[PDB]
Amino acid sequence: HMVGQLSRGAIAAIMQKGDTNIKPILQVINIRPITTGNSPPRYRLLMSDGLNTLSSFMLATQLNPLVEEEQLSSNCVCQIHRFIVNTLKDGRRVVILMELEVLKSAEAVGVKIGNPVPYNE
Amino acid sequence: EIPDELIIE
């Protein structure tokens, strides 16, 4: 029951209740760089709580070494210890990951867990 | 879904 390892319902809680006290366990589905200019690179993530995916996660730049040294990568399972929500002028919300711990490496997990569907914001 | 040019603003 691999989905029992993920905080099912955390994405809805973040995006509907603005709950930032939870420390949810999520799976990275994908990571890619965001287009940037003359600045530190920035990374965006598609994350899963087992029920939903959400593509609006951004890594704080202080966490860039986790991506660049390949510890945070697609399929890994991580616990979010500190995050903030930012709401854009157009109404869409971005979740900025400030502190996280990788609980299980991508190589130890190996696959997308469950069948999460995109969150309807 | 949010484009790169808007996600960082």
Side-chain angles (χ1 to χ4, degrees), chain A residues 32 35 44 55-56 58 86 88 92, chain B residues 1-8:
Chain A
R32 71 165 176 87
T35 302
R44 56 184 305 163
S55 65
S56 304
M58 280 194 44
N86 183 40
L88 306 182
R92 289 175 296 184
Chain B
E1 185 259 4
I2 303 173
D4 285 355
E5 63 269 22
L6 298 180
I7 200 171
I8 59 187

PDB file of all heavy atoms in Angstrom, chain A residues 32 35 44 55-56 58 86 88 92, chain B, unseen atoms left out:
ATOM      1  N   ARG A  32      11.995  20.588 -13.066  1.00  0.00           N
ATOM      2  CA  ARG A  32      12.692  21.181 -14.196  1.00  0.00           C
ATOM      3  C   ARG A  32      13.111  22.592 -13.830  1.00  0.00           C
ATOM      4  O   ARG A  32      12.538  23.207 -12.923  1.00  0.00           O
ATOM      5  CB  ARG A  32      11.835  21.182 -15.464  1.00  0.00           C
ATOM      6  CG  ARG A  32      10.686  22.146 -15.430  1.00  0.00           C
ATOM      7  CD  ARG A  32      10.175  22.310 -16.852  1.00  0.00           C
ATOM      8  NE  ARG A  32       8.984  23.149 -16.954  1.00  0.00           N
ATOM      9  CZ  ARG A  32       9.007  24.475 -17.081  1.00  0.00           C
ATOM     10  NH1 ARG A  32      10.167  25.137 -17.116  1.00  0.00           N
ATOM     11  NH2 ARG A  32       7.864  25.142 -17.175  1.00  0.00           N
ATOM     12  N   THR A  35      12.704  29.134 -16.496  1.00  0.00           N
ATOM     13  CA  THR A  35      13.459  30.098 -17.285  1.00  0.00           C
ATOM     14  C   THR A  35      13.891  31.265 -16.412  1.00  0.00           C
ATOM     15  O   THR A  35      13.054  31.932 -15.798  1.00  0.00           O
ATOM     16  CB  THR A  35      12.611  30.603 -18.445  1.00  0.00           C
ATOM     17  OG1 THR A  35      12.213  29.489 -19.249  1.00  0.00           O
ATOM     18  CG2 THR A  35      13.424  31.565 -19.294  1.00  0.00           C
ATOM     19  N   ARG A  44      11.189  24.281 -10.532  1.00  0.00           N
ATOM     20  CA  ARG A  44       9.782  24.035 -10.272  1.00  0.00           C
ATOM     21  C   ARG A  44       9.528  22.537 -10.245  1.00  0.00           C
ATOM     22  O   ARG A  44      10.207  21.765 -10.932  1.00  0.00           O
ATOM     23  CB  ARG A  44       8.892  24.706 -11.321  1.00  0.00           C
ATOM     24  CG  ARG A  44       9.205  24.312 -12.739  1.00  0.00           C
ATOM     25  CD  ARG A  44       8.329  25.119 -13.684  1.00  0.00           C
ATOM     26  NE  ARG A  44       6.922  24.944 -13.327  1.00  0.00           N
ATOM     27  CZ  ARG A  44       5.939  25.743 -13.726  1.00  0.00           C
ATOM     28  NH1 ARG A  44       6.194  26.797 -14.503  1.00  0.00           N
ATOM     29  NH2 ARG A  44       4.692  25.481 -13.348  1.00  0.00           N
ATOM     30  N   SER A  55       1.450  21.257 -10.009  1.00  0.00           N
ATOM     31  CA  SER A  55       2.649  21.664 -10.731  1.00  0.00           C
ATOM     32  C   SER A  55       3.201  22.998 -10.260  1.00  0.00           C
ATOM     33  O   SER A  55       4.223  23.455 -10.788  1.00  0.00           O
ATOM     34  CB  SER A  55       2.370  21.737 -12.237  1.00  0.00           C
ATOM     35  OG  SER A  55       1.437  22.759 -12.512  1.00  0.00           O
ATOM     36  N   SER A  56       2.574  23.628  -9.269  1.00  0.00           N
ATOM     37  CA  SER A  56       2.906  24.990  -8.873  1.00  0.00           C
ATOM     38  C   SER A  56       3.837  25.051  -7.666  1.00  0.00           C
ATOM     39  O   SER A  56       3.766  25.994  -6.872  1.00  0.00           O
ATOM     40  CB  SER A  56       1.626  25.781  -8.620  1.00  0.00           C
ATOM     41  OG  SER A  56       0.796  25.747  -9.772  1.00  0.00           O
ATOM     42  N   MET A  58       7.590  25.596  -6.172  1.00  0.00           N
ATOM     43  CA  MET A  58       8.874  26.190  -6.490  1.00  0.00           C
ATOM     44  C   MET A  58       9.830  25.957  -5.336  1.00  0.00           C
ATOM     45  O   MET A  58       9.455  26.058  -4.172  1.00  0.00           O
ATOM     46  CB  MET A  58       8.747  27.687  -6.746  1.00  0.00           C
ATOM     47  CG  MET A  58       8.242  27.998  -8.128  1.00  0.00           C
ATOM     48  SD  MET A  58       8.473  29.717  -8.568  1.00  0.00           S
ATOM     49  CE  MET A  58      10.131  30.009  -7.998  1.00  0.00           C
ATOM     50  N   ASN A  86       2.321  31.745  -2.005  1.00  0.00           N
ATOM     51  CA  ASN A  86       2.272  33.067  -2.619  1.00  0.00           C
ATOM     52  C   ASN A  86       1.175  33.075  -3.672  1.00  0.00           C
ATOM     53  O   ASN A  86       1.118  32.178  -4.513  1.00  0.00           O
ATOM     54  CB  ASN A  86       3.614  33.403  -3.283  1.00  0.00           C
ATOM     55  CG  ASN A  86       3.639  34.803  -3.881  1.00  0.00           C
ATOM     56  OD1 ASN A  86       3.116  35.744  -3.291  1.00  0.00           O
ATOM     57  ND2 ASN A  86       4.236  34.939  -5.060  1.00  0.00           N
ATOM     58  N   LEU A  88      -0.513  34.906  -6.862  1.00  0.00           N
ATOM     59  CA  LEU A  88      -0.204  35.799  -7.964  1.00  0.00           C
ATOM     60  C   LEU A  88      -1.356  36.770  -8.209  1.00  0.00           C
ATOM     61  O   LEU A  88      -2.486  36.572  -7.756  1.00  0.00           O
ATOM     62  CB  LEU A  88       0.054  34.989  -9.233  1.00  0.00           C
ATOM     63  CG  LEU A  88       1.124  33.902  -9.094  1.00  0.00           C
ATOM     64  CD1 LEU A  88       1.327  33.204 -10.424  1.00  0.00           C
ATOM     65  CD2 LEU A  88       2.430  34.509  -8.593  1.00  0.00           C
ATOM     66  N   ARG A  92      -3.739  32.574  -9.157  1.00  0.00           N
ATOM     67  CA  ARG A  92      -3.164  31.254  -8.957  1.00  0.00           C
ATOM     68  C   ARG A  92      -2.141  31.287  -7.834  1.00  0.00           C
ATOM     69  O   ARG A  92      -1.511  32.316  -7.552  1.00  0.00           O
ATOM     70  CB  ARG A  92      -2.566  30.709 -10.254  1.00  0.00           C
ATOM     71  CG  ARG A  92      -3.644  30.325 -11.265  1.00  0.00           C
ATOM     72  CD  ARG A  92      -3.051  29.907 -12.585  1.00  0.00           C
ATOM     73  NE  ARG A  92      -2.352  31.011 -13.233  1.00  0.00           N
ATOM     74  CZ  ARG A  92      -1.801  30.940 -14.439  1.00  0.00           C
ATOM     75  NH1 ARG A  92      -1.861  29.810 -15.130  1.00  0.00           N
ATOM     76  NH2 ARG A  92      -1.187  31.997 -14.951  1.00  0.00           N
TER      77      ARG A  92
ATOM     78  N   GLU B   1       1.430  24.460 -15.161  1.00  0.00           N
ATOM     79  CA  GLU B   1       0.320  25.219 -15.727  1.00  0.00           C
ATOM     80  C   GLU B   1       0.589  26.723 -15.665  1.00  0.00           C
ATOM     81  O   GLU B   1       0.375  27.435 -16.646  1.00  0.00           O
ATOM     82  CB  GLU B   1      -0.994  24.866 -15.025  1.00  0.00           C
ATOM     83  CG  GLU B   1      -2.228  25.514 -15.639  1.00  0.00           C
ATOM     84  CD  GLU B   1      -2.704  26.721 -14.855  1.00  0.00           C
ATOM     85  OE1 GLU B   1      -2.026  27.099 -13.876  1.00  0.00           O
ATOM     86  OE2 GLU B   1      -3.757  27.290 -15.215  1.00  0.00           O
ATOM     87  N   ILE B   2       1.052  27.210 -14.517  1.00  0.00           N
ATOM     88  CA  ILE B   2       1.527  28.588 -14.418  1.00  0.00           C
ATOM     89  C   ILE B   2       2.798  28.690 -15.253  1.00  0.00           C
ATOM     90  O   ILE B   2       3.746  27.929 -15.019  1.00  0.00           O
ATOM     91  CB  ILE B   2       1.817  28.996 -12.964  1.00  0.00           C
ATOM     92  CG1 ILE B   2       0.583  28.810 -12.073  1.00  0.00           C
ATOM     93  CG2 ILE B   2       2.293  30.443 -12.924  1.00  0.00           C
ATOM     94  CD1 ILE B   2       0.858  29.036 -10.593  1.00  0.00           C
ATOM     95  N   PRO B   3       2.876  29.604 -16.215  1.00  0.00           N
ATOM     96  CA  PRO B   3       4.093  29.719 -17.026  1.00  0.00           C
ATOM     97  C   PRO B   3       5.259  30.246 -16.204  1.00  0.00           C
ATOM     98  O   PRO B   3       5.086  30.895 -15.170  1.00  0.00           O
ATOM     99  CB  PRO B   3       3.695  30.711 -18.122  1.00  0.00           C
ATOM    100  CG  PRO B   3       2.557  31.487 -17.541  1.00  0.00           C
ATOM    101  CD  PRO B   3       1.822  30.539 -16.648  1.00  0.00           C
ATOM    102  N   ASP B   4       6.470  29.949 -16.692  1.00  0.00           N
ATOM    103  CA  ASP B   4       7.688  30.346 -15.986  1.00  0.00           C
ATOM    104  C   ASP B   4       7.728  31.845 -15.722  1.00  0.00           C
ATOM    105  O   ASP B   4       8.169  32.281 -14.653  1.00  0.00           O
ATOM    106  CB  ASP B   4       8.921  29.952 -16.797  1.00  0.00           C
ATOM    107  CG  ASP B   4       9.211  28.475 -16.738  1.00  0.00           C
ATOM    108  OD1 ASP B   4       8.514  27.747 -15.998  1.00  0.00           O
ATOM    109  OD2 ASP B   4      10.155  28.045 -17.430  1.00  0.00           O
ATOM    110  N   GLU B   5       7.295  32.653 -16.694  1.00  0.00           N
ATOM    111  CA  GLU B   5       7.380  34.101 -16.538  1.00  0.00           C
ATOM    112  C   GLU B   5       6.453  34.631 -15.453  1.00  0.00           C
ATOM    113  O   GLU B   5       6.696  35.723 -14.928  1.00  0.00           O
ATOM    114  CB  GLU B   5       7.113  34.811 -17.869  1.00  0.00           C
ATOM    115  CG  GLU B   5       5.726  34.591 -18.444  1.00  0.00           C
ATOM    116  CD  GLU B   5       5.656  33.396 -19.377  1.00  0.00           C
ATOM    117  OE1 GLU B   5       6.524  32.499 -19.272  1.00  0.00           O
ATOM    118  OE2 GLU B   5       4.735  33.357 -20.223  1.00  0.00           O
ATOM    119  N   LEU B   6       5.407  33.889 -15.097  1.00  0.00           N
ATOM    120  CA  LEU B   6       4.486  34.324 -14.054  1.00  0.00           C
ATOM    121  C   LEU B   6       4.739  33.662 -12.707  1.00  0.00           C
ATOM    122  O   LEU B   6       4.395  34.246 -11.673  1.00  0.00           O
ATOM    123  CB  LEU B   6       3.035  34.073 -14.485  1.00  0.00           C
ATOM    124  CG  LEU B   6       2.558  34.817 -15.739  1.00  0.00           C
ATOM    125  CD1 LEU B   6       1.102  34.489 -16.057  1.00  0.00           C
ATOM    126  CD2 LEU B   6       2.741  36.327 -15.603  1.00  0.00           C
ATOM    127  N   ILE B   7       5.346  32.472 -12.687  1.00  0.00           N
ATOM    128  CA  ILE B   7       5.487  31.732 -11.435  1.00  0.00           C
ATOM    129  C   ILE B   7       6.497  32.396 -10.504  1.00  0.00           C
ATOM    130  O   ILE B   7       6.409  32.249  -9.279  1.00  0.00           O
ATOM    131  CB  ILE B   7       5.800  30.245 -11.714  1.00  0.00           C
ATOM    132  CG1 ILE B   7       5.479  29.382 -10.490  1.00  0.00           C
ATOM    133  CG2 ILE B   7       7.257  30.051 -12.132  1.00  0.00           C
ATOM    134  CD1 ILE B   7       5.548  27.892 -10.759  1.00  0.00           C
ATOM    135  N   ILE B   8       7.456  33.151 -11.057  1.00  0.00           N
ATOM    136  CA  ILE B   8       8.491  33.787 -10.245  1.00  0.00           C
ATOM    137  C   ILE B   8       8.136  35.213  -9.843  1.00  0.00           C
ATOM    138  O   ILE B   8       8.964  35.895  -9.223  1.00  0.00           O
ATOM    139  CB  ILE B   8       9.869  33.727 -10.935  1.00  0.00           C
ATOM    140  CG1 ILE B   8       9.822  34.427 -12.294  1.00  0.00           C
ATOM    141  CG2 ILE B   8      10.324  32.284 -11.084  1.00  0.00           C
ATOM    142  CD1 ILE B   8      11.086  34.257 -13.107  1.00  0.00           C
ATOM    143  N   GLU B   9       6.938  35.683 -10.173  1.00  0.00           N
ATOM    144  CA  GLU B   9       6.526  37.036  -9.822  1.00  0.00           C
ATOM    145  C   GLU B   9       5.626  37.039  -8.590  1.00  0.00           C
ATOM    146  O   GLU B   9       5.957  36.446  -7.565  1.00  0.00           O
ATOM    147  CB  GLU B   9       5.808  37.698 -10.999  1.00  0.00           C
TER     148      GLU B   9
END
